[PDB]
Ligand binder design. Structure first.
Ligand SMILES: NC(=O)C1=CN([C@@H]2O[C@H](COP(=O)(O)OP(=O)(O)OC[C@H]3O[C@@H](n4cnc5c(N)ncnc54)[C@H](O)[C@@H]3O)[C@@H](O)[C@H]2O)C=CC1
Ligand SMILES: NC(=O)C1=CN([C@@H]2O[C@H](COP(=O)(O)OP(=O)(O)OC[C@H]3O[C@@H](n4cnc5c(N)ncnc54)[C@H](O)[C@@H]3O)[C@@H](O)[C@H]2O)C=CC1
Ligand SMILES: NC(=O)C1=CN([C@@H]2O[C@H](COP(=O)(O)OP(=O)(O)OC[C@H]3O[C@@H](n4cnc5c(N)ncnc54)[C@H](O)[C@@H]3O)[C@@H](O)[C@H]2O)C=CC1
Ligand SMILES: NC(=O)C1=CN([C@@H]2O[C@H](COP(=O)(O)OP(=O)(O)OC[C@H]3O[C@@H](n4cnc5c(N)ncnc54)[C@H](O)[C@@H]3O)[C@@H](O)[C@H]2O)C=CC1
Lengths: 316, 318, 315, 315
């Protein structure tokens, strides 16, 4: 009243699930944007009919024009490159990626600056902790108005695996994974709770062993690789995580969610984005919570941020 | 208590969205079954993590074994061929696919009979009015325990396009589409209401014209084609429609939903499945409602069933 | 963002259920206003804890001050009285209370005009079709920003009773009740559908008779009496009906809902509020739909509006 | 599976809100049972209409016959005295209700044994930790199939108050209150977290002081009295807490919820019910979690169970 406008910049796998979930939850009008012609229009048409089943009323439209950024309340960026040429046959590089995805962020940021400078922006494009800062820089939006997906998704894996071993509801496990999305993500064993009860109590009661916990941490780290091996880059859980973040903003819920945000001295770091618990409210990032890490924990957090800094320095 | 078991026989595009929606609604444990190796397992793992975001607790597992049909409460069949070397990259059709999908329904039917004969079955595989009857015949399930997807999806399109012209909530439009899923679907102009009000009133008040209605009618018939030409065969709205049907069963809601069901004299037809409103409750199909069509509407219904019979008669064509 | 502000002017039985449902649906911050001291503060404290179980974040506060209307997005008025003192329940009716309630609507109107002139207003206080016009006049709010509760609740009963005879989901019955809320309500048999199918088809197939339909019409008209003769106040269904209306506004859903709205030549009547299908969207009443009634139906609508005029000219 | 049946034994303030919430969530058919004639039939009629607004299909019926217990999946017991007949508020003595509510548990227990021995039972009647055990004994139901309301409600207050000081979503605060429902509830400061983060981190950062936390504890213990002083006993949040417990069973969610349950050695205590975290799934109580309390926390638990034992000894 008047209906929020959500622009999906990128209408691939994650984009399609997000449009579906937005309709289920009656969250706002959706523009599915892509550079690929016709594809976002077909997805939007199919998704728009699902309003009837959902008892919702969200316009869902497809676009190949950046003009549709005008009026956006929320912009979600999943746009990016992948795959490789000639290369033979398993040596697809990392890494350079990174200039190609940077050029995408330059293009998107320029239009955000021109067309929707007051939007709340969520960046998903990998490596997320690098790309979110690039978009921040190219778009000119305030620091409280842009974040990156990482912790909500990474902790959903950890929560889920622990919950299946302990035979409890998945959401009754709480856990924090910080620093960066990716292989350097910091899993904080000390902050795992189950129904509000420290994980250690379940270990002492022999409900789960130290070994099993370590195998679950390794599985959490290997999950994207596990699913890519079987199928493709994951998309259902990533979309669910993003919509949880977007909804906290649109409904001023003030959920505490771990996301990539600009660090300004926290954990000893500045001029860089990193994963940390934060509060998402109707004005955007309302609080950035700095965890009271011990020495071993801070050193893993430093390694996570050093890798973000490394990749960022490959951009010229 | 103790949590329904839902098996998706076919874990493609439609299968993926259904698993996603089942988790969102906390509806039951899900087995994602497919003949394609690794694909269901990967989709099931990705989907299982979304339980955290949804505050749900549905196990989601992937399978390449029919044994996992054991104990199913609901079985949803989207399984179908399936193209080979040739002969590309579009050479597919569906006329020649009829004997091939027949063979799929035989295989699935024999397994349902041995492993989950008390399941409620929803068939999606095209042409659905043909395939649902084939599954009924080879599974042995009672007539009230098997239906095909059609009307809920077809009417969603008609309801949607009308609501956008009249500027009202999509679900506040009501419409009935009967006969068969496909190009011979019967769109009943007489039975369209908007907030309970006959469509003819909005026409009389020049809010929409007769030409605009016919244009919306053509767009509804050709919607699958329109989306295929932009993208691929539709899957988000089909999944939503199937889940609304499954939920009515699992929660005994008793929604009146247009679905393909065994006709036993209704509309003058027997020994065939066709689309008609019916009531889905906790026992399956509780009521089959026969619309009181005029002569001109009945002729159209006749044409829909004739086309289903034509295709059924090609399950052994060479 | 920023979170809507909903003020409940009246915090009795219906107010209490409305605040509960607002939290369940996470629809906005709630101010529970009443003239009774401490009571709305007590209900608000209780209700605020239910945010935890609902995974919501709605502030629920109690107020005895009209100043809390400031910056309201939605104002729901149930302030007045349920039953006449000295009067029993075997007679449960209405009258002599009009002038008092007009003095309430004058007083509430004054405050709305000053503190929340851009709010969407829902009037619930009986006789609703009279009371909503009074508040409209004294609040100065535009015609598309104020409606009365009537048809959504009246039609919920008709839909429910028909759904139970025919063994289908209650919401799969559609029905229109118009004219006025109360004993002169116009139940339109022609407009009833079940799963989009004319009721007449089920009458033809002997699933329900013309006389059972007549008995359901009577039961619908007399439902409030039936409840009061058993123990008081419909409040649960009235609250769910109002929240359905409020939500359609707050979420721009554009539902077609029968409510009390200013008539401007529709059905032949003007300068009066009447019950008719409307579209509620993000800007308030976006459309008023005039049913194409036949002479027998238009005469019943006339008798409904005439009873509203009989009470309007009498304060 | 497919329409569960929920029987509400007691259709007073909490029963009315519970029936409302079951319909909203489409959780099951509802029987509103009470010894008061006509009243639950009136409440059930009002409530049934709300199925339309909710898009639900739950039958809601009122009853004065215990026959309605046959086929129950869940039975919720709020039946009981709130004050002794012929006494004033100045003469209030909580122990006075023990023999009066004991008689009610005996009556209800005999009918459960005969009619729905496989139902999951949730006891609400105060003092709940005593009453739940009386119903256990008289009903003969297995220990995994009967629990008392306490910790879900008590922790909702603590969670809510902390969340308002810290400006976060109420449900993102986690806390455990154990031992008994009432003034000797054990508020475990050590176990409080906010977004999974120990409460102490927020103290260290001066977002909240130790004194503020103490005043929150006091407020939490005294909330029912606060609400009564304004106008209670509380009913919205109690109803929501009970529905969260019943839903975890009906949908096999396996939520961890603090409820009153038979102690068989946990915390050094036996032959008594006390509040502790536990898992509710489709078979009932699937796990009872014994917290690893330190010595000081342990003595607070002992003091709470001592008071349950004192009151049980009165019978
Ligand atoms: N941050 C996180 O926790 C996670 C991040 N991801 C990342 O999310 C991104 C997207 O994932 P999927 O949807 O699975 O990939 P996808 O390949 O299916 O979608 C990418 C879409 O972006 C489009 N695109 C390319 N350039 C564009 C431009 N300039 N403007 C608009 N659209 C453009 C492509 O046409 C494609 O449709 C990838 O970078 C992936 O690595 C994936 C999972 C988790
Ligand atoms: N009834 C209706 O209103 C509509 C019907 N459809 C039909 O639904 C079907 C599926 O649609 P999509 O999911 O988009 O197709 P899809 O090709 O993505 O999914 C079909 C899946 O079935 C699998 N399969 C083949 N044989 C199998 C077997 N014996 N057991 C288990 N899986 C097997 C394939 O491996 C494939 O993964 C098609 O026949 C399509 O024409 C689509 C839309 C609407
Ligand atoms: N339009 C409809 O379909 C229906 C209308 N109603 C009507 O709605 C009204 C409320 O019903 P209940 O909540 O059951 O009544 P209730 O008596 O329980 O609550 C009314 C509240 O309004 C308060 N109040 C009185 N004057 C006030 C003022 N100056 N400002 C603020 N608050 C004031 C009273 O203190 C009382 O708490 C009654 O007029 C009732 O007859 C009830 C059902 C349906
Ligand atoms: N366990 C907890 O955390 C809490 C417990 N309570 C308790 O819950 C109980 C109910 O609370 P309210 O609904 O507010 O009280 P209420 O007085 O409104 O409802 C109690 C109902 O039980 C009925 N009743 C009495 N004996 C009965 C019997 N033999 N069979 C059937 N019905 C019978 C009465 O007619 C009355 O309608 C009280 O004992 C109260 O102390 C209240 C809040 C929290």
């Amino acid at each position: 009243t008047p209906k929020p406008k959500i622009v999906l910049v990128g209408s691939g796998m994650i984009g399609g699930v997000m449009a579906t979930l937005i309709v289920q939850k009656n969250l706002g009008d959706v523009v599915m944007f892509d550079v690929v012609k016709n594809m976002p229009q077909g997805k939007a048409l199919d998704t728009s009919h699902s309003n009837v089943m959902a008892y919702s009323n969200c316009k869902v439209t497809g676009s190949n024009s950046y003009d549709d950024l005008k009026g956006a309340d929320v912009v979600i960026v999943t746009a990016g490159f992948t795959k490789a040429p000639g290369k033979s046959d398993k040596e697809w590089n990392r890494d350079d990626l990174l200039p190609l995805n940077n050029k995408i962020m330059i293009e998107i940021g320029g239009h955000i600056k021109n067309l929707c400078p007051n939007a709340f922006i969520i960046v998903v494009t990998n490596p997320v902790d690098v790309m979110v800062q690039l978009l921040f820089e190219h778009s000119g939006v305030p620091k409280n108005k842009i974040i990156g997906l990482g912790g909500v998704l990474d902790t959903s894996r950890l929560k889920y695996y622990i919950s299946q071993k302990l035979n409890v509801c998945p959401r009754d496990v709480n856990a924090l994974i910080v620093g960066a999305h990716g292989n350097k993500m910091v899993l904080l064993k000390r902050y795992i709770t189950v129904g509000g009860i420290p994980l250690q109590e379940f270990i002492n009661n022999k409900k789960i062993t130290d070994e099993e916990v370590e195998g679950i941490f390794d599985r959490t780290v290997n999950t994207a690789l596990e699913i890519v091996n079987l199928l493709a880059s994951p998309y259902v859980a990533p979309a669910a995580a993003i919509i949880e973040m977007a909804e906290s903003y649109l409904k001023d819920i003030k959920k505490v969610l771990v996301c990539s945000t600009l660090l300004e001295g926290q954990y000893g770091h500045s001029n860089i984005f990193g994963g940390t618990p934060l509060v998402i409210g109707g004005t955007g990032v309302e609080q950035v919570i700095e965890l009271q890490l011990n020495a071993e924990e801070k050193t893993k957090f430093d390694e996570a941020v050093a890798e973000t800094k490394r990749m960022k320095a490959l951009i010229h």
